[PDB]
């Protein structure tokens, strides 16, 4: 029931140093938490990097190292490579089980940052005839992958009624696209007037909102 | 050459049961602690449990000990994961791993889908276009099982097409969107049709996507 917390996302550049951290809800991370680090590359390619706080898995390059920093466990990558762009999960041991943190999306800049173009689609008349209403927010051609999409209905923050899907990273220009779909019954859709998706991304100075009035 | 070869899985109804296997070659299986983890969209990586070489310590995250069971047969170099009374939230890719200082060797993954859905064709709805770049698409909603294929203008339109991974909805059905960007000055003069095929339901639909 302990929660292990990691940074959602970090950005570095090739050749630089980046440190990822791992926090425990129980108190300071200690050596008896035997911190482990696992890398997830695309195609669900998992690589164990570190176990028991400090120990490299055999064959892991020396540029990956483990430590404790203050009250947290840490993974440091020196001389970051674009191949190191991946998700990094830490796991802490609590006497008789591991708990993974939520993972950190690491960007190792392959190119200039690209803000998403944002488009919103109201439900079609045809879908309304079937008794449901889906509102689709499209974020096109952005990098890094980290992005926040928030739905507001009549200026009310939405929770629990949307799902997101994301493309594989483009092999030629390194960008992603993402859909966020707000799905309501036709009856619930008609209870409200303004539908908006608000998008946050490191390439945007301020959040971008696309909206429409039903 | 170390191989953790997984088998089993597939579709299970809510309340059902499944046993997954992981056969290990290239290492001395009887020397290794083994572990099961699962990966699901929006749910990160979750550690399920682990087992010692001699099976006399089997550790579980407490929330999963009631309906997951880990075992091994060293004579057949095989690790097993049993799941009972499964729920839709147990849909995931399940991975076996072996410990060497950390999580050193990994299986290729086993998909377990938990859904009570019947085979059903999608409804196809237009995402109508409404700057110099216009986005349009179609929403391919409420089908089962995977997959659907989507093309644009019978395959003549490929530049700028993004067909997203399907999401499994709380209903147990899948939904997917396919989008394309085109010049805004081209709306109306050019026709855009998305072609959708769902073989399990013998569904083939062509949907013209109009500006308004």
């Amino acid at each position: 029931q302990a929660v292990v917390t990691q940074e959602s996302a970090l950005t570095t550049s090739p050749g630089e140093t980046v440190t990822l951290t791992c926090r425990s809800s129980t108190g300071a991370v200690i050596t008896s938490n035997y911190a482990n680090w696992v890398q997830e590359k695309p195609d669900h390619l998992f690589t164990g990097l570190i176990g028991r706080t400090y120990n490299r898995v055999p064959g892991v390059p020396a540029r990956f190292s483990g430590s404790l920093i203050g009250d947290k466990a840490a993974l440091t990558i020196t001389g970051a490579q674009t191949e190191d762009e991946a998700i990094y999960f830490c796991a802490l041991w609590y006497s008789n089980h591991f708990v993974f943190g939520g993972g950190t999306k690491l960007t190792v800049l392959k190119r200039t940052v690209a803000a998403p173009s944002v488009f919103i689609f109201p439900p079609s008349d045809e879908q309304l005839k079937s008794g449901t209403a889906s509102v689709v927010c499209l974020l096109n051609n952005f990098y890094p992958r980290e992005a926040k999409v928030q739905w507001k209905v009549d200026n009310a923050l939405q929770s629990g009624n949307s799902q997101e899907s994301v493309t594989e990273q483009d092999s030629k220009d390194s960008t992603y696209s993402l859909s966020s779909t707000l799905t309501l019954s036709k009856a619930d859709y008609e209870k409200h007037k303004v539908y908006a998706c608000e998008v946050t991304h490191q390439g945007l100075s301020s959040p971008v909102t696309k909206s429409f009035n039903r | 050459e170390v191989k953790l070869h997984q088998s089993g899985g597939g579709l299970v109804q809510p309340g059902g049961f499944l046993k997954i296997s992981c056969v290990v070659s290239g290492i001395d299986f009887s020397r290794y602690w083994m572990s099961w983890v699962r990966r699901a969209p929006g749910k990160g990586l979750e550690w399920i449990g682990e087992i010692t070489p001699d099976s006399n310590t089997i550790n579980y995250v407490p929330s999963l000990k009631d309906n997951f069971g880990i075992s091994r047969d060293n004579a057949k170099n095989t690790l097993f994961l049993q799941m009972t009374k499964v729920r839709s939230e147990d849909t995931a890719l399940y991975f076996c791993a072996s410990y060497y200082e950390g999580f050193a060797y990994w299986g290729q993954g086993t998909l377990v889908t938990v859904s009570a859905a019947s085979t059903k064709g999608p409804s196809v709805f237009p995402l109508a276009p409404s700057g110099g770049t216009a986005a349009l698409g179609c929403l391919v909603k409420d089908y089962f099982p995977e997959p659907v294929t989507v093309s644009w203008n019978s395959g003549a339109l490929t530049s700028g097409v993004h067909t997203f991974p399907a999401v499994l909805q709380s209903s147990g059905l899948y939904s997917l969107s396919s989008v394309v960007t085109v010049p805004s000055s081209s709306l109306g003069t050019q026709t855009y049709i998305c072609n959708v095929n769902h073989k399990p339901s013998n569904t083939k639909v062509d949907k013209k996507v109009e500006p308004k």
Partner: peptide, 8 residues
């Protein structure tokens, strides 16, 4: 002799 586990 056994392979070292991921925790102590």
């Amino acid at each position: 002799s056994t392979a070292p586990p991921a925790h102590g």
